[PDB]
Amino acid sequence: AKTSMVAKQQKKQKYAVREYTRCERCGRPHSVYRKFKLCRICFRELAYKGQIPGVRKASW
Amino acid sequence: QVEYRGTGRRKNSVARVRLVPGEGNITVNNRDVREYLPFESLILDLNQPFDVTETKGNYDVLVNVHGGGFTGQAQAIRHGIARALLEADPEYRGSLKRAGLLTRDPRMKERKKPGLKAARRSPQFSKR
Amino acid sequence: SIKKGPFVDEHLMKKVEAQEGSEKKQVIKTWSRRSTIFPNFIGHTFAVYDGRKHVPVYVTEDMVGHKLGEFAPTRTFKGHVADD
Amino acid sequence: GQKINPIGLRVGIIRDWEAKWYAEKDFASLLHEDLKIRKFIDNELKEASVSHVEIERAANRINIAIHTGKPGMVIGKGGSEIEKLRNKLNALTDKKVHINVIEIKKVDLDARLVAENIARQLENRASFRRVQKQAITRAMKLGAKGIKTQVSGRLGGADIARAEQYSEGTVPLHTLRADIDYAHAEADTTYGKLGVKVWIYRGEVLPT
Amino acid sequence: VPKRDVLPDPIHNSKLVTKLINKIMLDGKRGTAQRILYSAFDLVEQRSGRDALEVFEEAINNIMPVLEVKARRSNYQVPVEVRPERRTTLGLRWLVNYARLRGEKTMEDRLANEILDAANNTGGAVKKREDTHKMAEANKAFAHYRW
Amino acid sequence: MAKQKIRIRLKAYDHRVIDQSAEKIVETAKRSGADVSGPIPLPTEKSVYTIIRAVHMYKDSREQFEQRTHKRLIDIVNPTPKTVDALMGLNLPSGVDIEIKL
RNA sequence: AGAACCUUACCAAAUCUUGACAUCCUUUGACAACUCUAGAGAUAGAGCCUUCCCCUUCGGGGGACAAAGUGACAGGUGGUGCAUGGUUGUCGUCAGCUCGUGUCGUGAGAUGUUGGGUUAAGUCCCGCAACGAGCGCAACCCUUAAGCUUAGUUGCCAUCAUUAAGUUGGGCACUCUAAGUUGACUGCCGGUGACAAACCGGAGGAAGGUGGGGAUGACGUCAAAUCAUCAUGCCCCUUAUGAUUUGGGCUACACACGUGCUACAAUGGACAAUACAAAGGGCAGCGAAACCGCGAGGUCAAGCAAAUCCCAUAAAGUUGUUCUCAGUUCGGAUUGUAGUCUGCAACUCGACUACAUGAAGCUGGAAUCGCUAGUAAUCGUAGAUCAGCAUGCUACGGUGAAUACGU
């Protein structure tokens, strides 16, 4: 399950990196950014909210 | 003495042309036209301005330039030339605009979107 | 490979020192993945945990080309009907 | 696709963010500072039914303001409450604050308030239709150029899910100078869960 | 839908050269075709002493179809004049495409052989002309009373 | 190059708020002195974050994001403790990121 | 958008019961660390010391610890995506779909939205028992093409001096940088056309008929996909369908399928010299100079929170020497050895260099896909994910074409 894996990636560790930097609120590990530590969908569905700085979008 | 000066824009490049009266002898970056172009023998096309305008020629030239491959900036040359020959006299525009060489070609690269990858090819379908 | 230099997990050596200076075994248990052979470990009978049940292998003098880290894979026949 | 929210489209032009602070590239400390703020407010929302809270953040301080139709819930009688909330906030925020209530005006025409409301009548098993007709109706008295109002799921606590909508007035959507108040909600009674998708449109205006 | 010309090329002074080099430019290397063609107009003059335009222009008349077909419908096919644009396009197109099909190891020998044999009315270019002009303008009777 | 000088940097995410704020601190700079430098621009770095509109699959239909970052550059000559107060007096509004320097 | 472990859900083994973990009551207490033992770890077995810190008038209050009881409990990657929310594809940026009032019809339904003309567009005019509204296309916004003003460091060096070098004096003319505004709208002329819409051509301008592009996705459809992002109804598990750990596998191998890479060599291969970018990242990270080494790399340390400095030579190309058609100096698979870095440890299963090997293959059958101009074709660069690891993904530019008879 995911619940004890929260505890897994929370505790002390034997050495530097058995770690994974997963999303704070969403329990997904994959497709995560270090800048925000937010997963794929969650950054998006919050990005629409007008909460994080900033524009976003369509100039490239 | 006196000289004229207009820029050159094309194809992700920028050229600052310096038009001095003279015999015609050109050194971009203090370096001759042959010394800058591979191979290249399409250079008379940069002298297309001199055949139609300021017929036959010529004026000595100085210029500084950077950015983009040799072609697009070799043809960034042309626009400060025509503009500068119009700085001299607007006489010359009538034979220019029936030939162009002055409308800084607005076209250049295009963004991607899914389908194009490490080289520019759009994708296939799943057959059989 | 190795950054200068060879090594052992250093629970293995601590066991097999007392095993070896005196009379030896025909039998050992281990995990032996972060470790390897070098002259102290010859003749003794190690058994890497294959995944299911460690199998006794007796080390040989010539196990310089082969090592300790593995002897009997997890694939184990085959997985496939045909063979080599 | 299929469709999107306008707010992530209208943002950048005609709405500031609900959250504001210094970048410095260290966001995560401060954005996940904001994240717990975004959690705890639910225990005001439940009594207050608020629209949206801002976080401005100067260097050494915090400055927020909660948009409500019900001030009396949160202000306390004579200030009995917001100080208490500062106390229960500093315990986890671990830094000072000047929480500064704000009232939103033409007070109940707003979106998340009203979406929440219609959800509330769906919580006590109100039939679906009157909720929506009365929503649009009172909205139209209060002044507006057009409203959409939607529900999804298993209606009447019944068989396989459906969805309808009773919109009125013009709801300029694919345009780009609108300033519309989109929201969303949830509610459970017995069967699955019921969301909505409110919308409004109330005239064209920029933030400058 | 119109053509968007290529201007001149003053090596050696003419324009058909300009339309020519672009077809040889496999994979966008314009200097290589530039070189080997220009040298081809050195060597074609070297062997069989003459002018570059004599061998070149004469050949690309000799290998240049002027009547031609196209299919439509059972299997009928209209004989059809060639526009001057496509006229030269076919001349040069099939010219290089068969000039490949010689099979020499050299850049320019294959070409000088090609257009200097064509200019002698020999070589698979001329054979292509004779085949197209064979099936065409021999079965004209059925497909001609149309556009 | 050697000279008595003040210099700072600003950062924010909106050209209107940053340039009106620049109008403030320039106005107050020469309010208490002279020899101000105008609001000199800077390339305005960017970012990107490509994400799939998805939960489970369908990577073809991707989506983007970005975070523009204005950068502004101001200098003053002949320092004095008053234009100091013009710096540390008014940044407002405070989406800006001032770093007062010399 | 990173599988040695970790991740990882799956398997073997040793292990646990308010549990890995969260809330509640009691009971305390600020919290802890380093070694030994045994053990693969999980763990405990002992030393040792965590120590009422914010507030106390002997109690106490508190964020926060505590081991034990501990009932409520907790947890389930446990099923149903044909019970749901949310989210996303697809028909398709296809140009259409609908509502009111009124009329006809016994009625279902029709009427508008039809016809003529017109458009990329239900775009628009005219005509007409139809009048209006909405959703939709267009615009509205970002970016791009030119100019004007503003501002001049880290950017630039035209006037000059000086210099390895714009490096510094000086300069902001030009380039540029990002801000404000001008412009393109059938809009000006001419013809055509129901005079109208509109079509055609002419000038001007940098840019003419949505100027290129992006974002944007109607009513709905496929009982399309997801209960494994999450949330959740129902149903089910509970001394185990929950839990910790070591090792393992998710990467197997007679075969087929699809996606993509490099090849089948003279526009070519090897060696040497040599010029032109754009965009983006770097603080516990970029790694300059110099030194060692054939090399990956190593020492060493300057500058660097960035227009400053590093990443970072751009490569293709251009000029030269040689090669002269061979399974070849073609190709670059597989294998052995010797080594570099990261990580504890590269055995299943990392990456990398050096030597040697020197595979199949000499343009592809039946069928078949992509693409209308900065496109295809084609060369390299940067980044995310990241202890190490991208032929893939995304963007970035460089060179740069042929054809479009016609429906």
From Swiss-Prot, chain A:
Role noted for this protein: Binds 16S rRNA, required for the assembly of 30S particles and may also be responsible for determining the conformation of the 16S rRNA at the A site.
Name of the protein in its database record: Small ribosomal subunit protein uS14B
UniProt entry tagged with the keyword Zinc: yes
Cofactor(s) for this UniProt protein: Zn(2+)
Gene name per UniProt: rpsZ
GO molecular function, one term: rRNA binding
Quaternary data: Part of the 30S ribosomal subunit. Contacts proteins S3 and S10.
Similarity annotation: Belongs to the universal ribosomal protein uS14 family. Zinc-binding uS14 subfamily.
Annotated Zn(2+) binding sites: 23, 26, 39, 42
Pfam family, one: Ribosomal_S14
One GO location term (cellular component): small ribosomal subunit
Curated annotation (Swiss-Prot), chain D:
Record-given protein name: Small ribosomal subunit protein uS3
Cellular component GO terms held in the UniProt record: cytosolic small ribosomal subunit
Family designation: Belongs to the universal ribosomal protein uS3 family.
CDD domains hit by this protein: KH-II_30S_S3 (cd02412)
GO terms for MF: mRNA binding; rRNA binding; structural constituent of ribosome
Superkingdom as given in the UniProt entry: Bacteria
Subunit and interaction comment: Part of the 30S ribosomal subunit. Forms a tight complex with proteins S10 and S14.
InterPro entries for the chain: KH_dom, KH_dom-like_a/b, KH_dom_type_2, KH_sf_prok-type, Ribosomal_S3_C_sf, Ribosomal_uS3_bac-typ, Ribosomal_uS3_C, Ribosomal_uS3_CS
Function text: Binds the lower part of the 30S subunit head. Binds mRNA in the 70S ribosome, positioning it for translation.
PANTHER family, per database record: 30S/40S RIBOSOMAL PROTEIN S3, SMALL RIBOSOMAL SUBUNIT PROTEIN US3C
Domain KH type-2: start-end pairs: 37-105
Annotated keywords: Ribonucleoprotein, Ribosomal protein, RNA-binding, rRNA-binding
A biological process from GO: translation
Any one Pfam family match given in the protein's UniProt record, by short name: Ribosomal_S3_C
From Swiss-Prot, chain E:
Matching InterPro entries: Ribosomal_uS7, Ribosomal_uS7_bac/org-type, Ribosomal_uS7_CS, Ribosomal_uS7_dom, Ribosomal_uS7_dom_sf
GO terms of biological process kind: ribosomal small subunit assembly; translation
Cellular component per GO, a single term: cytosolic small ribosomal subunit
Keywords, alphabetical: Ribonucleoprotein, Ribosomal protein, RNA-binding, rRNA-binding, tRNA-binding
GO molecular function annotations of the record: mRNA binding; rRNA binding; structural constituent of ribosome; tRNA binding
Family matches, as HAMAP family: Ribosomal_uS7_B
Subunit record text: Part of the 30S ribosomal subunit. Contacts proteins S9 and S11.
Biological role: One of the primary rRNA binding proteins, it binds directly to 16S rRNA where it nucleates assembly of the head domain of the 30S subunit. Is located at the subunit interface close to the decoding center, probably blocks exit of the E-site tRNA.
UniProt record similarity statement: Belongs to the universal ribosomal protein uS7 family.
Protein's UniProt name: Small ribosomal subunit protein uS7
Organism of provenance: Staphylococcus aureus (strain NCTC 8325 / PS 47)
Gene that specifies this protein: rpsG
Swiss-Prot record, chain F:
Keywords, in A-Z order: Ribonucleoprotein, Ribosomal protein
Keyword Iron applies: no
Disulfide links within the chain: none
Molecular function per GO: structural constituent of ribosome; tRNA binding
InterPro entries attached to this UniProt entry: Ribosomal_uS10, Ribosomal_uS10_CS, Ribosomal_uS10_dom, Ribosomal_uS10_dom_sf
SMART domains in alphabetical order: Ribosomal_S10
Superkingdom as given in the UniProt entry: Bacteria
GO CC, one annotated term: ribonucleoprotein complex
GO biological process: translation
Annotated SUPFAM superfamilies: Ribosomal protein S10 (SSF54999)
A family per Pfam: Ribosomal_S10
Job of this protein: Involved in the binding of tRNA to the ribosomes.
Protein family according to the UniProt entry: Belongs to the universal ribosomal protein uS10 family.
Subunit structure: Part of the 30S ribosomal subunit.
Name of protein: Small ribosomal subunit protein uS10
Species the sequence originates in: Staphylococcus aureus (strain Mu50 / ATCC 700699)
This protein's encoding gene: rpsJ
